[PDB]
Amino acid sequence: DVQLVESGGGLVKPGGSLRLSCVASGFTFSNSEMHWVRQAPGKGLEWVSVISESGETTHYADSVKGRFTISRDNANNLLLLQMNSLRADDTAVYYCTRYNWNNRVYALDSWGQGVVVTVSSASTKGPSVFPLAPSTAALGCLVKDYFPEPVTVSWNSGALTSGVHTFPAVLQSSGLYSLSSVVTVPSSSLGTQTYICNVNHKPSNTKVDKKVEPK
Amino acid sequence: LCPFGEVFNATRFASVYAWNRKRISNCVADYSVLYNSASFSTFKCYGVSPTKLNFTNVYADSFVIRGDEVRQIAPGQTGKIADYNYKLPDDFTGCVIAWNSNNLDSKVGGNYNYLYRLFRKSNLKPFERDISTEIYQAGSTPCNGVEGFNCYFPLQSYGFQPTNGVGYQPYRVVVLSFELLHAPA
Amino acid sequence: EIVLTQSPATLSLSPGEGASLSCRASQTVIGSLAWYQQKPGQAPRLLIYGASSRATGIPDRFSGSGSGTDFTLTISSLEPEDFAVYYCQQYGNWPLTFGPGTRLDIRRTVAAPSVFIFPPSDEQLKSGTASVVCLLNNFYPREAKVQWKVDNALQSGNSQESVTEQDSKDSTYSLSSTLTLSKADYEKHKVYACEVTHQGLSSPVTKSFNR
Ligand SMILES: *[C@@H]1O[C@H](CO)[C@@H](O[C@@H]2O[C@H](CO)[C@@H](O)[C@H](O)[C@H]2NC(C)=O)[C@H](O)[C@H]1NC(C)=O
Numbered sequence: 001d002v003q004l005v006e007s008g009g010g011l012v013k014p015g016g017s018l019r020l021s022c023v024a025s026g027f028t029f030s031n032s033e034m035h036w037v038r039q040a041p042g043k044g045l046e047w048v049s050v051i052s053e054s055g056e057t058t059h060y061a062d063s064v065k066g067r068f069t070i071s072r073d074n075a076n077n078l079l080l081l082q083m084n085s086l087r088a089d090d091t092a093v094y095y096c097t098r099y100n101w102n103n104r105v106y107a108l109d110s111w112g113q114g115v116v117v118t119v120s121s122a123s124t125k126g127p128s129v130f131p132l133a134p135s136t137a138a139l140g141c142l143v144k145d146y147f148p149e150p151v152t153v154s155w156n157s158g159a160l161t162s163g164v165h166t167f168p169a170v171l172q173s174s175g176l177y178s179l180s181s182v183v184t185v186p187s188s189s190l191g192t193q194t195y196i197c198n199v200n201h202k203p204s205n206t207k208v209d210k211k212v213e214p215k
Numbered sequence: 216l217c218p219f220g221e222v223f224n225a226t227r228f229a230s231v232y233a234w235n236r237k238r239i240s241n242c243v244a245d246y247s248v249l250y251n252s253a254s255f256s257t258f259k260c261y262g263v264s265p266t267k268l269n270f271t272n273v274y275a276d277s278f279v280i281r282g283d284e285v286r287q288i289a290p291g292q293t294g295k296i297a298d299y300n301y302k303l304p305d306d307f308t309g310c311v312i313a314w315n316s317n318n319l320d321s322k323v324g325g326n327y328n329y330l331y332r333l334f335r336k337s338n339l340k341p342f343e344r345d346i347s348t349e350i351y352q353a354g355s356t357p358c359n360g361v362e363g364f365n366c367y368f369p370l371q372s373y374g375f376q377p378t379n380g381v382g383y384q385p386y387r388v389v390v391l392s393f394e395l396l397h398a399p400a
Numbered sequence: 401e402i403v404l405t406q407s408p409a410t411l412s413l414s415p416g417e418g419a420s421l422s423c424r425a426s427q428t429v430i431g432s433l434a435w436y437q438q439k440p441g442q443a444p445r446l447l448i449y450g451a452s453s454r455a456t457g458i459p460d461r462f463s464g465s466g467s468g469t470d471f472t473l474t475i476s477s478l479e480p481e482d483f484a485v486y487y488c489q490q491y492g493n494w495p496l497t498f499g500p501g502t503r504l505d506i507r508r509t510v511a512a513p514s515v516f517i518f519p520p521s522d523e524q525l526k527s528g529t530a531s532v533v534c535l536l537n538n539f540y541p542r543e544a545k546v547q548w549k550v551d552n553a554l555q556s557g558n559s560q561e562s563v564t565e566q567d568s569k570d571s572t573y574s575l576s577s578t579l580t581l582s583k584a585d586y587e588k589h590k591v592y593a594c595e596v597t598h599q600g601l602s603s604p605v606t607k608s609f610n611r
Contacts, residue, residue, distance in 0.1 A: 044501050052382030052383075101380050138516040138537065140535070167564060182574075317492060317494070
């Protein structure tokens with residue numbers, strides 16, 4: 001079975017370097033032209049680089065040429081992308097993919113699972129959880145000023161999911177992430193039913209259970 | 216001003232076995248501008264840097280190969296192009312420039328106009344140009360003038376299709392050599 | 401550089417209908433034109449190559465056609481799993497380029513949003529910053545307009561918006577808009593208002609509070 005497994009992503013400060021790797025299995029790697037393709041958060045696909053089957057021909061997109069280097073080790077079924085002088089623009093999920101022309105499939109045939117690359121000067125910081133109190137009512141939790149992704153949110157330890165909306169995080173000007181999770185509930189249950197939001201931020205070992213009640 | 220435009224920006228390029236050579240005399244040349252054209256996949260200089268040249272004769276050889284053979288245009292290199300089509304000297308002082316030309320030298324159904332020499336009796340000497348079309352004798356039987364058992368035509372077509380991979384796409388190559396003699400400039 | 405444009409940007413259809421998606425190149429595509437489908441959190445999946453060749457295992461309700469500078473992808477009868485993002489892509493010209501993508505969502509009856517406004521918590525104010533949150537709950541279609549008004553003055557530049565994915569059950573969307581301002585600026589004003597314009601509202605709806 002054809003499989004491409006990627007590794008090597010992580011956090012890097014601006015100007016830093018980072019080496020991504022892709023391991024191939026279930027096909028003749030040495031007979032496969034390979035590409036790196038990236039996708040910034042909330043954006044489309046953008047081609048990064050290509051290397052031929054033998055490794056003797058490579059091509060790059062303009063924005064990464066001279067900063068990135070694609071390479072391969074056909075003996076070890078290995079494809080590599082060395083990224084230097086990284087900037088915020090380079091923040092993206094990076095995919096490894098084969099262009100299967102030798103099998104008359106003239107397109108990006110097989111894809112890896114993708115690996116996250118974040119370029120930021122921010123440091124690890126746990127989120128602060130603030131209550132969006134109610135006054136059918138709506139209540140919620142504001143999970144603010146954390147780094148890096150991700151944060152998980154649940155209500156009543158997973159017992160409450162109906163009417164829950166956990167919004168995608170946004171990247172604020174400060175370089176820290178923020179997020180909101182809300183739930184609509186019957187107004188009658190505001191005084192009797194208890195509503196607790198559980199916020200987990202593993203990168204900082206943060207676990208917060210905040211009870212949301214009318215002010 | 217040097218006629219570098221009619222070398223690099225020529226509408227058609229020679230086959231590698233019949234590679235072109237333009238001589239360069241007189242002229243004022245800006246090699247940093249040539250570097251800064253910024254449309255080159257390969258710009259490798261041996262024996263001099265592009266920011267140092269700014270001679271008597273300058274030779275600009277131009278041709279087309281496939282991508283994976285661009286590495287063969289280099290001193291001390293080996294392979295079909297280096298051995299039978301275009302050979303660089305070990306003491307080469309100059310530059311090798313290559314850019315992908317899949318948009319120009321490729322067409323749907325295949326472009327078979329670009330040829331290379333597949334067979335030869337011996338390796339090419341540096342800067343040698345062999346345009347012979349004699350049937351190669353690969354066996355004891357004298358070929359006379361036909362092909363067959365151990366009798367082959369010496370030239371083969373590249374077959375450039377647009378959907379080829381990078382290593383099998385057309386690349387246009389210009390090689391600059393800087394020959395100084397006991398002569399003016 | 402072959403710039404690929406995809407039209408329309410969004411397509412709202414019911415399951416069982418047909419979808420037609422357009423890709424236009426800024427110059428002739430001499431190589432291969434391909435169509436990919438992408439779901440949230442997954443890698444793109446190859447549907448069509450060579451503008452008309454269907455990839456192995458792809459259901460035959462997917463087809464492609466076209467040439468030169470114009471290509472179309474057709475999904476004959478839409479399945480629930482087909483609501484995703486679709487990209488065209490060209491090979492042969494460098495750089496390799498993708499379209500910006502066409503988003504396919506489920507169409508349903510118009511649903512005006514429920515609007516809620518949330519003042520900053522006193523706990524957050526103790527830290528020196530104030531966040532005001534406006535929630536637009538369970539609306540369709542996704543297009544909606546949110547305007548902040550502080551003491552009857554329209555605000556711009558200090559607001560961030562977030563949108564959920566289309567709901568699996570009722571096919572609605574939810575939106576949040578967060579107005580962030582320093583505690584100093586927050587205590588300088590009294591009336592904080594969120595004004596919502598949406599196809600399901602005959603007149604804009606305002607939710608407000610006094611500090
Ligand atoms: C091939 O043609 C291009 C297009 O004119 C040349 O690029 C120009 O280069 C000069 C410097 O030599 C600049 O002043 C122009 O602004 C460039 N124009 C463009 C559109 O890029 C290129 O130099 C030519 N090739 C060679 C070897 O000279």
